[PDB]
Design a protein around this ligand. Sequence first.
Ligand SMILES: O=C(O)[C@@H]1O[C@@H](O[C@H]2[C@H](O)[C@@H](NS(=O)(=O)O)[C@@H](O)O[C@@H]2COS(=O)(=O)O)[C@H](OS(=O)(=O)O)[C@@H](O)[C@@H]1O[C@H]1O[C@H](COS(=O)(=O)O)[C@@H](O)[C@H](O)[C@H]1NS(=O)(=O)O
Lengths: 189, 188, 189, 189, 189, 189
Amino acid sequence: GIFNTRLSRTFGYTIKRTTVKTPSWAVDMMRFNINDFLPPGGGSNPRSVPFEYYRIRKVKVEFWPCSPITQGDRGVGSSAVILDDNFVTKATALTYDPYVNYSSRHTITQPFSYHSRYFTPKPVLDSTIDYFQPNNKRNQLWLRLQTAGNVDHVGLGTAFENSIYDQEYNIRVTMYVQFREFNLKDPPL
Amino acid sequence: GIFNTRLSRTFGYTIKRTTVKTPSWAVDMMRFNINDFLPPGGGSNPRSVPFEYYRIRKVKVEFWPCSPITQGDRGVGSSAVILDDNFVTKATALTYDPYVNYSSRHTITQPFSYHSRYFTPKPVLDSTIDYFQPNNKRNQLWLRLQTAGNVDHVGLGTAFENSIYDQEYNIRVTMYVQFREFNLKDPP
Amino acid sequence: GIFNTRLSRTFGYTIKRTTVKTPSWAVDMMRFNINDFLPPGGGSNPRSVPFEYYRIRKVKVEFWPCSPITQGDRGVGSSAVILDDNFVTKATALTYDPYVNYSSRHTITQPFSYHSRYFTPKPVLDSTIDYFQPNNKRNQLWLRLQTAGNVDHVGLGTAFENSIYDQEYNIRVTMYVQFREFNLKDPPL
Amino acid sequence: GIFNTRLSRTFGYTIKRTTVKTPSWAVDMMRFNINDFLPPGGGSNPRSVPFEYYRIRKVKVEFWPCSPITQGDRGVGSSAVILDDNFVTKATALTYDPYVNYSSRHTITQPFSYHSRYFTPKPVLDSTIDYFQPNNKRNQLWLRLQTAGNVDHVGLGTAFENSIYDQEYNIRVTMYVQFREFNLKDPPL
Amino acid sequence: GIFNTRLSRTFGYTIKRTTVKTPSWAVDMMRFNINDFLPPGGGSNPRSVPFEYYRIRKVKVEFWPCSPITQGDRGVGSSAVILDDNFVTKATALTYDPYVNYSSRHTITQPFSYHSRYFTPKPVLDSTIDYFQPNNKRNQLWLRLQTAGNVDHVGLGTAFENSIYDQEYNIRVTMYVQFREFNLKDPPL
Amino acid sequence: GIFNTRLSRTFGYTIKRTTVKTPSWAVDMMRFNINDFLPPGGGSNPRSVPFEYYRIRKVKVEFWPCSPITQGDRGVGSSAVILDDNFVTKATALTYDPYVNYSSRHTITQPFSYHSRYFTPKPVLDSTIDYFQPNNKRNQLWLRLQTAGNVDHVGLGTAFENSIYDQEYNIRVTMYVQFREFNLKDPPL
Ligand SMILES: O=C(O)[C@@H]1O[C@@H](O[C@H]2[C@H](O)[C@@H](NS(=O)(=O)O)[C@@H](O)O[C@@H]2COS(=O)(=O)O)[C@H](OS(=O)(=O)O)[C@@H](O)[C@@H]1O[C@H]1O[C@H](COS(=O)(=O)O)[C@@H](O)[C@H](O)[C@H]1NS(=O)(=O)O
């Protein structure tokens, strides 16, 4: 019983100002979990979408700027796809862009420019070995939609060039999911 | 955001014995409401299934017997589709079968036999005037999925020949619905 | 169980004389109900036609004159189709023909001339909103054939030019109906 | 104004037990009249189906058993079509099956078995001469739908083998009729 | 007597400022009635467009901004189509965008960006059951053009992200309507 | 914004009796103005049909008789088309039919006979020079729909033969007009 749908979530991210003169970059990570998109249900149905299995097909991360188009001290960054839960260490002012030479690098124009990334994440099945599957719609694993313990999906790391002014963003993540085995429970009343 | 699916429910129905000698029948109706099939949800989502709209396509009533095959005093009855919520009056022992001559009559063997009906019900918009639409998948209306006030649908009435023994059935209903407008809400 | 048939009914209508010199018109309305065409039945069958549902397909209103061909002070009127239960107010001597500029106006030659109107009426489902369906034989609503409370169908308004002489008519309404679900009940005797 | 429809009626028939050891048969007859299927009407319409003429096209006699499938002392009988109102005399325990060598004989398995007969009856126009028409849909006579004096149609006789146990049946007769000349009368009220 | 035309109306909407730091959204509703587009007439014609029936085909809601392109604290919202008169409750600062996961969601870039929505509304025939028709130009119901009591059409709800600055808009609604049965009345003078 | 419609108006005309023995004719004129067909509107819309420009395409003058078919002293007259506002002088009993030799003459049988004339009128732009355009649907001038000062259109003159009895008529003029530039005004309320 397949049901392809779309789940979204919005949150903020700010790159604080720095008095540093050099071009330094701010590094951060981004994971994706389905608990943040799918709330708990009620009653005999533990989740709000009554299905048993799921598998995330795609994610769309949108960096919607919060800064005016008149803001100066512009910069240039990079967003890369990291499917293994080993990101570059979080840094405030690093002397280089680590994600620049990555094959999945897209340039981030800053601060007042929109940046989208559309990709297929991978689940963290074993963080010790960090193995994942290649892209195959027919062979992608089905995970279970747990009650409160779903596994973290992974796949984006960023590097933003710091500035004299604060750079704020409203980040909207949209997960395109595919459920299976409609499992609604209908007790009496 | 269409989503076809299937919902079901189970309950019992019995026909108490009668010392009457003549062939008499017992009458009873049957309504259909979605609140019985779809429990309430939790939190911001009032219903377990997050959509706004629905419109019933079909219903499948299943009279599963509870009796053995060796039971005697066999009889015969009838069921018919009634799309107005104005049925024949409920009765214990009536001297004729009202539902026999209706064009939508399907015979009912008794007591140990399976019986099924597969049709399109209709809603009750105005019980005074009792109007509805002909069968059309494209022009069917879209109803709202209320919080605790959904409308009763209709479409079946029955007539069972009485007997010396108690006739018990397990009734399974199955609905084929079609939702729209995925309306999930994700608070922090 | 479809059964298309034809039901008729006959009644009178008179436009009384007036001493008024001007050309004035007499306005009146005309509704259609199935109780006036279908009598009550007997016994377990509440109606004389043993069916459950109905829907009126067409109506033929015939103004059969009662006046001789030698009658003078002739006039000219109008009949229009009003599918919403909001007619022009009934008037005895109105200074104009209200139904003249209606798109459904047919001229009524008076007094000794035959006038027919053949159209599809509409039921009064909500008199507050006054909504109706367009003409579609396949999508027309089925109403219930009630016992003594059927709903009024609507669709004709008239305007007759007054005269020094009385203008009488014998009006024959014929409804072309379509029933469904033969529901005869046969108790013993 | 033709209207083909279907009228039904249900009643009981029992073959009482006998201590007789031999195989004996119980003989009985079955006539069909339209008064038992069509009740009287009400008012100016004397009958509930408002038509003038009729002619019975077919009849379906269904012997629905009332006995369990575990009942013993089973037997074998015969049902024949008798279109002339001269049946074998009614008998309780006759030493043979009279309807066995009839060209229209169908075997009746007893007691817990269903038996249907579908045929075209004939009316009793003259019981002295007992004449009837062959099967012709185009030339079949139209009778009048009388008020309380319709003529008996004929066409089935049976022979059931007796048993130590009582053999009950619920007999459902269905007549497929064809009416003509819709004659509804609509007085005022 | 069909006459397709276009009726417009302009009004304001402001999202007041908030000292709240989080990303919160301001929720509001939008209904459409023909009294706000069609004024009352004069004399025997109760309305200014002399027709009897109407049905709204489409509506175009245009959010024309009032804010300069230099305004900061930009945001992102959502507009959805709600054809049933049960909107998300009006809120000043809600912690999420309710209309984000709706199938009819269009993103609203704020504050200095134009947003249009072009759709087919539905009338509020029964607010208790809240039933409506699918899109069909041939089967769409005709309503009556009442004098002062027309029924509210429905179909848009919004969610605007709040800001430190006031966000003003000039909203221009354009209804594309279709009238029927020209009913002009011409008394003497 | 073109809208072709049809506007009507009804009024009386009587040819009084004369004791004169000779065959004499009664001459009269007939002009057409849109104020008599289109009433004043209400509010910001000065007219009831909300358009700016107009041009009359055709007019249908219908002489509907008021006299019985048994009336004697019958006669014969003439109706001609006069597109220039210079009619034959109005006369009570003229010794000849002036409109008889006109190229646009149609015979009027009197008194109990119907007479129609269907033609294209012309406006009175300059009564001193009396110039008009030939018939051309594509080149016909657009006039303005004034508030209370529209220009008179012209195009029919008649000659009725007098009689011992009074000859009454109900004259129904129907103008087929074509408007342009829908100009509805919708203030608030
Ligand atoms: O007691 C609760 O309500 C807990 O709900 C869930 O935690 C939510 C919290 O409910 C929610 N607020 S709400 O408006 O009350 O819904 C918001 O605070 O987020 C928190 C954290 O959610 S997150 O998904 O962890 O981010 C948890 O349940 S669930 O989301 O896993 O379903 C859990 O912490 C609580 O629910 C459990 O307890 C309920 C009450 O009974 S008892 O007193 O705990 O025995 C029980 O009925 C629930 O079934 C149970 N949740 S289960 O699904 O894990 O069984």
